[PDB]
Design a protein around this ligand. Structure first.
Ligand SMILES: *[C@@H]1O[C@H](CO)[C@@H](O)[C@H](O)[C@H]1NC(C)=O
Ligand SMILES: *[C@@H]1O[C@H](CO)[C@@H](O)[C@H](O)[C@H]1NC(C)=O
Ligand SMILES: *[C@@H]1O[C@H](CO)[C@@H](O)[C@H](O)[C@H]1NC(C)=O
Ligand SMILES: [Cu+2]
Length: 201
């Protein structure tokens, strides 16, 4: 006496969003009935086939709010909705968070001395490891990149790169940009073997 016609998910503003913007996910259903009775709905939210939201409600649409959306939020989203029986599940929708928050650059000394070092802390606090960092040392007098040292944090939110003050330095500045692998796909063949070789001694 209940038939669920179609089931759908939507994300607002889009399924592609700028890092840090506000986001809302919706799992609605369309159910036809002859009954007079108010049905119970259960909405189940999956990211990459793992259940992150389980809600039972009288209305046929429910929502989930994602406050400041980061790259670690992108992935495959689908919702399953059940009524009394007859679940139906939505398709897979790719949420793509694009863009990296501008990195925070911090230093140990405001003023250094020749031969000393500067410890450069480049970070992206709002995000999650692993991040790849590129830090360039600029002497302002000549807009040449005096030194370029890239590093790939794996465990952490940031890097700390030590930069040397060479004897011909006056006013220094450090420039960091961070990049993060949004997605990677890697595949393996199966092993194959070869004609036996018979060492004969
Ligand atoms: C995102 O929502 C929060 C509340 O969770 C609000 O304080 C903030 O202003 C919103 N940011 C944007 C970009 O709408
Ligand atoms: C879903 O949530 C309800 C509680 O609201 C629980 O009774 C039910 O077992 C849960 N099922 C799954 C698979 O999450
Ligand atoms: C590096 O800087 C970030 C923010 O700039 C900070 O959260 C982190 O604690 C710093 N690392 C240190 C002090 O070792
Ligand atoms: Cu979040």
């Amino acid at each position: 006496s209940f038939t669920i016609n179609s089931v759908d998910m939507k994300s607002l503003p889009d399924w592609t969003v700028q890092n840090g913007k506000n986001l809302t996910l919706q799992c609605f259903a369309d159910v036809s009935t002859t009954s007079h009775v108010k049905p119970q709905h259960q909405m189940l939210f999956y990211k990459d086939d793992v259940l992150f939201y389980n809600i039972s409600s009288m209305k046929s649409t429910e929502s989930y709010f994602i406050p400041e959306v980061r790259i670690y939020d992108s992935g495959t989203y689908k919702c399953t909705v059940i009524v009394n029986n007859k679940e139906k599940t939505t398709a897979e929708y790719q949420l793509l968070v694009e863009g990296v928050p501008s990195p925070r650059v911090t230093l140990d000394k405001k003023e250094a001395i020749q031969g000393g070092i500067v410890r450069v802390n480049c970070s992206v606090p709002e995000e999650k490891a692993p991040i790849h960092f590129t830090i360039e040392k600029l002497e302002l007098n000549e807009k040449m990149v005096k030194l370029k040292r890239e590093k790939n944090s794996r465990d952490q939110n940031f890097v700390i790169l030590e930069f040397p003050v060479e004897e011909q330095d006056r006013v220094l500045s450090f420039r960091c940009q961070a990049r993060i692998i949004s997605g990677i796909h890697m595949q393996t063949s199966e092993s194959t073997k070869s004609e036996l070789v018979t060492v004969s001694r």
